[PDB]
Design a protein around this ligand. Structure first.
Ligand code: HEM
Ligand code: HEM
Ligand code: HEM
Ligand code: HEM
Ligand code: HEM
Ligand SMILES: [C-]#N
Ligand SMILES: [C-]#N
Ligand SMILES: [C-]#N
Ligand SMILES: [C-]#N
Ligand SMILES: [C-]#N
Lengths: 237, 239, 235, 235, 239
């Protein structure tokens, strides 16, 4: 039910990044192929309860080789899966990178937008395989929360407005992360055109809302989306 | 039989949050050797069950760079020190990197007396009846501004704080430790909940009151975990 | 070169540091590993451009840097993932990693016609020049400004730098959204004291105070062919 | 004794953490290592004073702390380099390291005569008391004030602390120029709840807002003879 | 015999500060093997005795996370690069974790000319005649404001700076390297002294002038060490 998890509300989303130790290559090739096999099996073992997608950060994001985007209706399940993964022979040679959670929620400000804008917001992304993926954690300043509903709705309409020209070439998803870690939002983007995504962020950097981002990125995780087998394959030969 | 509940609720009781992370080499130990290690620890906690209260949380896979957390109640910190030092001594403890470590006294309320009587009434309910609830720990440091204020001013801020939280008194258990002078934070807040989505909302609500902007440090780290008996946690390290 | 001057070309800066246990390897093993990499680079020399810098002894916690030009970052990813896969790469701790596309000038058009002319000069005729890389993040104020305001700030920026237009080669990469910086600046020079003066000069204009992040890290190295660098790793 | 109260006596705070690979050592080798250190300390007990604190289980990433007094830092350097040279010292990752000279009072003379009187009492009747160490750095503003202004700030500081003069011993080291802090504060007490109140009290005076750095780390430990501390690592 | 001092006093001479920390595995080497390693380095330095000047400082036990520091003078940084790369290559170097690394040009005074003639006279004095003095290194970054100032304003600030420091020209040797553009600081300051208490007072004095508040970065790290010949430092790593 990928359909259900990727779009519904109440679905927790977790982003876990990992980096491979050096002593992993001190292991003989044989030991490594077995290790890869263990993990692929574990992920397949969980495919019933949760969704797991893989990203190659190696060579695009500093100090990170692999990232999982995990959807689940409870974080407990996500915990059980991640603790197991980190337990495997492969997991034991991975230094845990960033770990961020956030629930997907129903839109809060879109209702107060022009009806013509709601129409355009119907489109989310393109039809693409092995797209780039970008993840940007966000913390708002105290000011942002002090604002009243009308004020923020105005800021968001300005945010949305600037982004409309990229509505097709950049898929987007927003996770509400407050209280589960040190950020207010987790933003997630898929795109085949990074030059568009770059322009999309400069455009958003010029709206008013932007200056309220006490934390913007750190880390800004850039990677290529790919099946788990092809990623681990690189660590076996 | 045993008034264990006193430590968990009484005032003057020091409360300590110690996190640990497991080394990679812990699995170089044979599966059997690891299960023996669990028993060593389980016994040690039981040996101390007279002097202190110890509760366990699985942080692995929810909190970055942390696998295990203990919430230790004790009427003096030397005792907590001895136990934690002993724990780190067990075979298992020898393969644990000490993570964050925070202390704080639980005290009788300072501002609640100046609230409306209807508010004092509602604050009697603390949490739900739940087993294996999520647990959250958020360290907090107030800015210099906050301390410069007078009692009346602060009493007003906290009354606003309480009001914002009222819709969540049931679905979120709470406890506050006074941590100033024992480390680099002023308070240690601790919460149990079965619905994190509520807790998320509880925090968005508090983010919008006045008091909030006086938190020079809020979280960093924000420790999220599952509450569970010590056996089941250590069991996981024996696969 | 097509990649070095045209727009739309991604530029990537990847830093590496050599592990201690690398020298525990026997002399033979070290030289064979060197050969593996040299081959990998030529293997990619068709799809991408790769240049090397010895940071060892000039930049802290860094021995080596690659500047990789490519029309897609996927290629750069594949190459870097491969490089770190070689026996040599397996003894390298990934240092800093930054990407940025080369873009068509945004403010130069609004400059005086005499200034546009002078900007045609970029650098000197030099081999094995020093190289410097300085990442930059602008503050929120800077983006809020209007085109005229920014066009003005940059014109003052350009003005301060004109006396160094000859002795300092320059290139600017637009890095926003691919990492935690807005620009990646890259400079080649034979005279660092000139480059030092160029930066002290720029520190005094208005624009400068809008650089929320300036350096961190400031990567200083000598430019050199890949062979000569790895050779030091063949002792 | 001699050193703990006179001026011109440098005081050094050194923290250490025991590595994991220490428990891979056989039990005997560890006791021999323990014996080594105990000897080195007694060997130096003539020239300098050294005291021990068990931070293990009270301060994160710290097991042991030394408070070393000496009339010159040269001596303290020699001792600390030697200590870290010992078999045990080789299994300790150095934590924080801070220096500060003990100096004669600067602001106390301008206080009320009744206040000078009360400050004569310093501490309690305690054995194996808790110890707290808090580094402090003042902001630029604090130094900009004139002597009269600061003297007022200190008098408000002193006033707030008077109720705790008996249950809390204090010592102040002047650390500017020997590291990245201006002051190192050190306190012994049997009641932490008192010390807690002492710090909550002082947080409310005016002076406090001038502390650009407060703690980081705030080292909490129990004071104990070196023998009983090392004993735990010989099991 | 050797005009070594060309580097220590001339302008246009790059000065580089490199710190190192000794790995744990260095003591796995047999005693004899370590002494040979010392000889290798002593030789490498003497091999370079033509092109550069190298001085050594023992940071072990005075500076956090650092054992050894080199102050290297060279007319080009490439030479310093090659030397440091060779040094880091030696048997000894292979067991050293590279700490901080900072470069800076020695330049002729910019503000001293605009001072009173009585002040220029006093500034002729630099330091004392002392052996094995303490050494301090403080990296510095000025804020944007400082550069926005005009020459006259900065000259005033520096004259106030100089004035505050006049009482210490005897007990504290000083040197200033202009570091902007070679790393993340604008200046590298270097001091030798037999009396740290004097150096301490010197810094409180400078903390009270106007100029000081423009130091966006001050120290971090503040490197304190004892100056000594390379052999006696390395000698300590052989026992
Ligand atoms: C085509 C691109 C984008 C579109 C259409 C878009 C639109 C929106 C909309 C409509 C909302 C609020 C809707 C609601 O909660 O009811 C929102 C929220 C948000 N967006 Fe975007 N956005 C885009 C790109 C981006 C980018 C590139 C970032 C980069 C950081 C970003 C960061 C955020 C954050 C942090 C929020 C949370 C604000 C809040 O709800 O309080 N968005 N976006
Ligand atoms: C159901 C949820 C909550 C309720 C009913 C509640 C209520 C209260 C009350 C009545 C006090 C004053 C008690 C006293 O010290 O006399 C207080 C203090 C405090 N609360 Fe909460 N609160 C809730 C949630 C939270 C959360 C979610 C946080 C932070 C993440 C938080 C942080 C604090 C802090 C730092 C204080 C100490 C203020 C001080 O004594 O100076 N509280 N709370
Ligand atoms: C001889 C030396 C230099 C010259 C001639 C020069 C000239 C220019 C020019 C003409 C532009 C406008 C680009 C455009 O219109 O898109 C520019 C942009 C820029 N320069 Fe330089 N520059 C020099 C050195 C430097 C240095 C040393 C730094 C930083 C350490 C730097 C940082 C930047 C940045 C961050 C931008 C992009 C600003 C923006 O597009 O918003 N430049 N430079
Ligand atoms: C019983 C408790 C305390 C007493 C009686 C006390 C009293 C004093 C007095 C009289 C001075 C001025 C010394 C002089 O004239 O040179 C002073 C200095 C200082 N105290 Fe305290 N204090 C106490 C606790 C604390 C605590 C708990 C802290 C920090 C958490 C602290 C931080 C400082 C600092 C940073 C200075 C140096 C100020 C300066 O010289 O510029 N003190 N103290
Ligand atoms: C006896 C001690 C000292 C004396 C006589 C002294 C004197 C001077 C003088 C005359 C200058 C002007 C140099 C020029 O024209 O370029 C200067 C520059 C400078 N001094 Fe000192 N100083 C002393 C100590 C210190 C200390 C202890 C520090 C920092 C911890 C320091 C930081 C600086 C810096 C950063 C500059 C460069 C400012 C600029 O060129 O914009 N000085 N000093
Ligand atoms: C915005 N997603
Ligand atoms: C609120 N504890
Ligand atoms: C300037 N590039
Ligand atoms: C106050 N020492
Ligand atoms: C002034 N050095």
């Amino acid at each position: 039910d990928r359909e259900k998890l990727l779009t519904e509300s109440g679905v927790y989303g977790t982003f876990a990044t990992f980096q491979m130790d050096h002593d992993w290559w001190d292991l003989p090739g044989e030991s490594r192929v077995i290790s890869v096999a263990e993990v692929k099996g574990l992920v397949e073992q969980w495919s019933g309860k949760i969704l797991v997608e893989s990203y190659l950060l190696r060579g695009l994001s500093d100090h990170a080789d692999l990232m999982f985007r995990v959807h689940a209706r409870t974080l407990s399940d996500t915990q059980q899966f991640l603790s197991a993964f980190m337990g495997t022979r492969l997991g034991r040679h991975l230094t845990s990178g960033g770990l961020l959670h956030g629930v997907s929620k129903k839109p809060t400000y879109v209702a107060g937008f022009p009806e013509s804008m709601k129409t355009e917001l119907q489109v989310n992304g393109e039809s693409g395989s092995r797209p780039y993926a970008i993840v940007i954690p966000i913390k708002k300043d105290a000011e942002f929360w002090a604002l009243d509903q009308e004020a923020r709705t105005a800021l968001m309409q300005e945010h949305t407005q600037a982004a409309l020209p990229y509505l097709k070439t950049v898929k987007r998803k927003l996770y509400h992360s407050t209280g589960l870690d040190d950020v207010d939002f987790i933003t997630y983007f898929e795109t085949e055109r990074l030059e568009d995504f770059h322009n999309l962020v400069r455009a958003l950097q010029q709206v008013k809302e932007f200056r309220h981002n006490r934390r913007f990125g750190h880390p800004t995780l850039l990677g290529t989306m790919s099946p788990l087998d092809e990623i681990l394959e690189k660590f076996a030969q």
